[model samples]
Target: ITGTSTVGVGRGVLGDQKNINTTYSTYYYLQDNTRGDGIFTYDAKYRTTLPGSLWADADNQFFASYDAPAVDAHYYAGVTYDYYKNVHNRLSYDGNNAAIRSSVHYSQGYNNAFWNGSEMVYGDGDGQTFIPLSGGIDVVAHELTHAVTDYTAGLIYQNESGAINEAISDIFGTLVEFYANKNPDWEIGEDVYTPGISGDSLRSMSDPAKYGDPDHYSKRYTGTQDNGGVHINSGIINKAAYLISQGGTHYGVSVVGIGRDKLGKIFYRALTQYLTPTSNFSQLRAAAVQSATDLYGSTSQEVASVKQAFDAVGVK
Candidate 1:
């Protein structure tokens, strides 16, 4: 629907109030034309469908419980887009400012969210496990980063390459969280995971092992489950990233912290410049090293920290 650009006030899933960009046709539609091409949000209505329906409201206000997920999804997509454009100089996930779209309330009791090649989808989780996934900014960014990876590295989503892909998403997701200045932490999905439990998250970048994930190469899961444990093995790379940004001693290897800004620069360079579809953990280390060297010189502490971080994670 064609309409005038408008801003509407809404409350997100966590009961936080904010303004969202919307289109005011006959009804205010959740199609934000302010960012790049646009950011469109939809309602899945408890059904499994792609881009179900463009959310519409008679008035320019959204506050109902059913409207919570859509509000957060739409708002957070803009935040993530802003993060990439402002912080990394990338337009949208595609670097061409492609329109971003999302669908909330995907399916009954669904507990996951994903970037389905062209658009993002969020699940309204069972009350015990999760409330609504878009409530977590990190979760939204993590999924969107998958889109970025698809357009840039095109990393194959299996085995080592898959783990690298997952880690890249987690890394940028945390970076975007910090960029948004929202109770930032080196944790994933803390804002949405396990509503009944406090201080628990889907995974931890600072210490992946807290969730029984491997923080070292020796502990890397080689089994066939979870696409060779892509999510499980990502801990190795995530831990390495945390060490690079916030100095740590892992497996007797010490890494000097390089800070988040440098960590993001090195990783972003590696992702967009040196990584490939089949790049493995060893190759990822090389890419990060070259990236740091290119950005901060071979003799810079950034280069040394990248090397030590990989070694700390036993990546070789």
Candidate 2:
């Protein structure tokens, strides 16, 4: 929707007040034109259809209970855009400033959110399991990173490639969370995962085994479900990424922490410049090593840390 770009006040799912970029056409719509092409949010109306309708408000103030999801979805999308553009020098998920779109209120009691290749979709959880998922910046960044992977690495969504894909999302997702500096931790979906549970998250990057996820390659899942355990086995790669940023010892192998920025630079380079659709875990190690070598030279500690992180995770 073409219109005058304006700012609107809104409260997110967590009841925190914030400002959102909106467009004022006939009605104020959740279309932000400030970043790249645009960031658009829609109302799924608790149905399963995609990018349903561009969210419209009469007064340009989003404060109702039902408006919580849209507020966060729209606002967080812009934050993610800033993350990629300001931090990575990338325009959008496609690296082409493509319009980012998201739909909230997708299906009643829906417990998950995802990128459907074309756009983002968020579910209104059944309350026990989750709240509106966009409430979590990591969740939003995770889904959007999938789009980035789709455009760049295009990793196959199964087996080791898929686990790499999932771990990439989690890696950048955690980085984005830390970038936002909002109660940042190495946990994924902690904010919106469970309202009843006091200190539980969907997954943990710092300690994947906290939830029975494999923190080492020797324990990788080989099942057919979950796209050959893409989610389950991602724990191994996630552990490696975590070790790269925050050193740890696994299976008696110790890694020297290289800090988060270098970790992101190495992996971002690997994802965009080295990784391929069929690249497996071993290939990922090679890509990261080469990326670190490119950025910090062959003799740099960054390069050595990348090697030790993968070794620590038993990736070999």
Candidate 3:
């Protein structure tokens, strides 16, 4: 997979001392056939502005300085790739050796970064407040996980499915960060923005209450913002996953104990191997519990915790 241009770009940052280039590539030969291409490519020419970066049309700005975008993108991408391969034992996107492509510094002064269903796109933050989203592993993993969701589950980007989609990404993204840094602390997007911000991250995993947000499920959850609050309402499922992994209580009630790594394995396995396009929270919870039981024993604490955590979150 490392020798084909069809796989996109090969891995290896120019002028870096590591000098170790990623020769393996995954690519799509035909629009339909997925195979190994053996090369990954990254380019900065294709640009877009993030929501925070949008100014006047002509003078849109980037959050991070121009020089920093690639560095951030490189680090985040490596983390994401490593997470998928090591934890999931999946080669790349598509599970068929598909080369992943990323374009950074998209659009002058862009404020948002998104995955266009093919490659990852990032915008430079508008210097004052936000920084480039690509700087953080959670954001990068969030986008890449979208691709994974699209391929499997194909959850519609609305209502509960949309929220689940977002939650899955956040769940894994946080895990990737934790796995990469070997930190048990559960803060998302802590590294991207400047330290001047009052909070350490865009979201809190260990204590959602500290962020003045509801950590449990509610009927009021509707798809109001950003495709049914896929990004916002996702907190419910995110907390559910976290609770299951960490073995804690949400509203002062004791929950079962399932270690983070074990819970992650079950969820990832269910998502990739069993989930369908229309699967909602109910279906997801059931699948994950079943996956845990199957991987571990039906009497295992991990499987019990997966169910107990969902119940605590109001997912019946």
RMSD of each: 0.6, 0.6, 7.3
lDDT of each: 0.95, 0.94, 0.65
Clashing residue pairs, candidate 2? none
In candidate 3, position 207 carries an lDDT of 64
- Candidate 2: where are CA atoms >4 Å away? none
Candidates 2 and 3 compared: the better one by lDDT is: 2
lDDT of 2 by residue, 171-210 (tens): 9999989998999999999999889888899998888999
Q: What's the true lDDT of residue 139 in model 1?
A: 97
Per-residue accuracy of model 1 over 175-261 as CA lDDT, tens digit each: 999999979999999999998899999999999999999999999999999999999999999999999999988888989998999
Question: TM per model?
Answer: 0.99, 0.99, 0.79
Stretches > 4 Å off in candidate 3: 1-41, 49-65, 182-184, 209-213
